[PDB]
């Protein structure tokens, strides 16, 4: 057991060096922000399809990460994610956590409201709660799940381990940018092998995501 704490938060993690650094590059550079922001818990049901969150819009409302800097809005930041699934030893399943850079969701949803009186627009900033996927096999774009493992990824197999951390550096054509318009990457969590449990046990297994920025500059 290890109580990793940096700043204000305190979390418990295993003593495993199963970290994966995206593209082999640590986030290098050139006070009240380096803390573990833990998101809402998503419940994995028996027939769920998958969830996705986009970055760095996930820490815009909660937190002050995208607080307007009244000087100028040039920012540059990396991240450190943590996905963990607290299940018992009688459940079974497998997850696939992967960050794919520059995701574009072609699929459209109706959104909250229209009366066929404007074309229904689409939402691409799920934000805090994330959003469910529609057709997993294609990942709401044409990409096949099969080949998702070409990006940085980690398997969460409920038989062996319940932790998966990915260190992701900054990746963009320009060194700084206006935050609200852009979205750098997307984390996806897809149940490739479905959940199963014999009747009587708990029906929904929880999933917890924890984010920690790595020196977001403003200079």
């Amino acid at each position, epitope marked *: 057991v290890a109580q990793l704490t940096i700043g204000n938060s305190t979390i418990t993690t295993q003593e495993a060096a199963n970290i994966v650094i995206a593209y082999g590059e640590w986030p290098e550079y050139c006070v009240s922000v380096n803390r573990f922001f833990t998101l809402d818990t998503k419940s994995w049901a028996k027939d769920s399809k998958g969830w996705y969150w986009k970055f760095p819009d996930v820490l815009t409302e909660v937190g002050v990460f995208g607080q307007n800097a009244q000087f100028h809005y040039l920012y540059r930041s990396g991240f450190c994610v943590h996905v963990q699934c607290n299940a018992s030893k009688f459940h079974q399943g497998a997850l696939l956590v992967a960050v794919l850079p520059e995701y574009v969701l072609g699929t459209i949803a109706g959104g*909250t*409201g229209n009366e066929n*009186s404007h074309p229904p627009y689409a939402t691409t900033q799920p934000g805090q709660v994330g959003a469910v996927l529609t057709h997993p096999y294609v990942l709401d774009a044409g990409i096949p799940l099969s080949q998702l493992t070409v990006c940085p990824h980690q398997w969460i197999n409920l038989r062996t381990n319940n932790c998966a951390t990915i260190i992701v550096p900054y990746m963009n054509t320009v060194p700084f940018d206006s935050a609200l318009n852009h979205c750098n990457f997307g984390l996806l969590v897809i149940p490739v092998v479905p959940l199963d449990f014999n009747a009587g046990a708990t029906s929904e297994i929880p999933i917890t995501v924890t984010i920690a920025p790595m020196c977001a500059e403003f200079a």
Partner: nanobody
Amino acid sequence: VQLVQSGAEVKKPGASVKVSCKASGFNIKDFYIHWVRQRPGQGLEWIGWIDPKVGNTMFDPKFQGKARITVDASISTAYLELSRLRSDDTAVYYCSRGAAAYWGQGTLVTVS
């Protein structure tokens, strides 16, 4: 289901007003709430709608700076805050969910 609104106002140039739009029966977080205008003796105009779920608000190019739409979920309102009024901004204002279902009564504003 009807959208009732505030009363008329008489103001001076350079001021800032805000009209109100009451919801009734239907939930406020579901439909878009558009806002339209009618200068006296002129055809209907359009300002902008609001997405009440997350807060997407977008306006016609003309009033890009001037206008500001906000929504409140508790008391179920929809405010349109004008600012920097000129002699051209005398008109009746209406709030309507989508286009068809209902609209509200006209709220005339006076800047003279």
